[PDB]
Design a protein around this ligand. Structure first.
Ligand SMILES: [Ca+2]
Ligand SMILES: [Ca+2]
Ligand SMILES: [Cl-]
Ligand SMILES: [Cl-]
Ligand SMILES: [Cl-]
Ligand SMILES: [Cl-]
Ligand SMILES: [Fe+2]
Ligand SMILES: [Fe+2]
Ligand SMILES: [Fe+2]
Ligand SMILES: [Fe+2]
Lengths: 125, 125
């Protein structure tokens, strides 16, 4: 595994993010955890690809060009902003807006989001 | 596992952070990953408990009251700031200062750091 990869157990729903990579295969519920590769699921890009906007002091990330649902069983569980050697994670909940604000000094950033149904998505400025 | 717990494989060195919890036990290299519980290792608190300094527009986190080494065989691998539903991670490298700045408008925060040898430490304001 490599730093910042996200892995899911499809049995029990554990989802983890790698902070230090290594060669071992991550396992949960007696099977290999699935690597949630970004932008690989068949789903509406308009609702899943993050849109990155500047704000005073940082960035606002919206999921997506069309606001994604935030329902009990279908919501954006978190949005991340990646820059340099930083990974900023904003967890979200049903009933909230599908967006996040990050205060950061960084000219180049990557935004990620994870949808509990449609998996892992990213964009960059 | 629960959100924001940190688990290490003691065989290959994978370290992961939980983004979504669940009931299965995380496994790597055919053994249960170790839960890296904060402030449990026998290590100098002066060099490991984060120091949280309020600054204009956020917090500066220093590891620790005495600066921790940042050597190839002994360094702080990351510092995090936790506030409500955020987890901001700053990765570090040998040769860098053992500190991080986070722009987080929150009165109450928890700072964490992970040392490659002495494990996982936290403090709160
Ligand atoms: Ca296998
Ligand atoms: Ca993070
Ligand atoms: Cl890596
Ligand atoms: Cl790594
Ligand atoms: Cl959708
Ligand atoms: Cl020490
Ligand atoms: Fe392992
Ligand atoms: Fe979705
Ligand atoms: Fe599992
Ligand atoms: Fe240490």
């Amino acid at each position: 595994p490599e730093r910042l990869q996200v892995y899911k157990c499809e049995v029990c729903g554990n989802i983890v993010e790698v902070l230090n990579g290594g060669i071992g295969e991550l396992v949960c519920c007696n099977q290999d955890m699935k690597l949630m590769s970004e932008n690989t699921v068949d789903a509406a890009k308009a609702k899943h690809v993050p849109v990155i906007e500047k704000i005073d002091g940082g960035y606002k990330v919206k999921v997506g060009a069309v606001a994604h649902p935030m329902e009990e069983k279908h919501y954006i569980q978190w949005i991340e902003l990646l820059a340099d050697d930083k990974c900023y994670t904003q967890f979200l909940k049903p009933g909230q807006a599908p967006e996040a604000v990050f205060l950061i000094e960084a000219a180049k950033v990557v935004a990620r989001e994870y949808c509990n149904i449609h998996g892992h998505w990213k964009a960059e400025n």
